[PDB]
């Protein structure tokens, strides 16, 4: 690894600088280097890892959607043949996206998940595993698609099972997990009623636990509850 010679603490410091400079590819490369040092990640470090890759893959997904739409338009009746270029470039972006997802999944498998014994860390990583399989599923079309979808589902389900046993219903990781698993159900698994049920139950159980929270915890929990409500409004 190109980051093998840099100190762990220096990689974390540079990830924070990269975030400030909106250099998310660099940020992700630094955090990959930090993970590869082999030690567990603190809460702050887990956030840096997830922010970096979320932004990289988010940009790839946005680009893939633009290109996919152009390609779909080009394959409509009445469209003039433009050659292989749209497909080729969509495939290029797709392959780069798949590569980033595989990289993140590899970090989680070697060895972040297995070394995460506390519920908060294990749930965090299993959420990420569901998310990155979900991004693979968004572009998948081959013999493997059903298995990619099931890998996302299985990771999210294990995270849900641990979070319900070990975390309060207002915990932001538990809430964000449920938000994203609900989106999985709606957009990936073609289970809109499951998505709506999960978002509603999550919102209501968080509402009932807000009274236990400090003002600062309340802010984080209510922000995610508003995203649940936003999705419910979009879907109903």
């Amino acid at each position: 690894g190109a980051m093998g010679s840099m100190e762990r603490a220096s990689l974390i410091q540079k990830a924070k600088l990269a975030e400030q400079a909106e250099r998310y590819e660099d940020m992700a490369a630094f955090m990959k280097g930090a993970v590869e040092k082999g030690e567990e990640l603190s809460c702050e470090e887990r956030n840096l890892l997830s922010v970096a890759y979320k932004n990289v893959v988010g940009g790839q997904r946005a680009a893939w959607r633009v290109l996919s739409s152009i390609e779909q338009k080009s394959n409509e009746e009445g469209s003039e043949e433009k050659g292989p270029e749209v497909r080729e470039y969509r495939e290029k972006v797709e392959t780069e996206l798949q590569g980033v997802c595989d990289t993140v999944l590899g970090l989680l498998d070697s060895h972040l998940i297995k070394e995460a014994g506390d519920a908060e860390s294990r749930v965090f990583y299993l959420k990420m595993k569901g998310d990155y399989y979900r991004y693979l599923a968004e572009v998948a079309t081959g013999d493997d698609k059903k298995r990619i979808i099931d890998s996302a589902r299985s990771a999210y389900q294990e995270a849900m099972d641990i979070s319900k046993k070990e975390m309060p219903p207002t915990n932001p990781i538990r809430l964000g997990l449920a938000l994203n698993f609900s989106v999985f159900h709606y957009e990936i698994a073609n289970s809109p009623e499951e998505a709506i049920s999960l978002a509603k139950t999550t919102f209501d159980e968080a509402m009932a636990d807000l009274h236990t929270l400090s003002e600062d915890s309340y802010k984080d929990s209510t922000l995610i509850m508003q995203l649940l409500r936003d999705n419910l409004t979009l879907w109903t």
Binding site: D131, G176, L179, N180, V183, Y186, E187, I224, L227, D230, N231, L234, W235
Partner: peptide, 5 residues
Amino acid sequence: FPATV
């Protein structure tokens, strides 16, 4: 697109 975090 729906919200995720």
